Amino acid sequence: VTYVPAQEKNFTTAPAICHDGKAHFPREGVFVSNGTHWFVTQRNFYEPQIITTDNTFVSGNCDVVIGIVNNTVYDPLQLE
């Protein structure tokens, strides 16, 4: 008994998402975009999610990553 994916869909990717002077690589899953806003989703299914500070781990300088894309990450600590 096996599992087989189906029904693919083209998207747009980016290695990282640069917030204020940092890199913010994802923890698990790609960084995909619809055509407007960026989301983080799994690798074998399509479950988009908002880019919150618990889905991404941050380490960098926003200078050495080739192909980085500008977007804002969210955090549940500033609100509360």
């Binding site: 087989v4 994916p5 189906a6 693919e8 083209n10 980016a14």
Partner: protein, 39 residues
């Protein structure tokens, strides 16, 4: 209307991929297939 013909083999269906610097293809559905194997 029936006869025997000779042809060269076809290795498979002709297909090409669409590689690019920024493009992903993420499935949004699956299937379950049950194969068999005899030994």
């Amino acid at each position: 209307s029936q006869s025997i013909i000779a042809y060269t083999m076809s290795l498979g269906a002709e297909n090409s991929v669409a590689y690019s610097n920024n493009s992903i293809a993420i499935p949004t559905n699956f299937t379950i297939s049950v194969t068999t194997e005899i030994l």
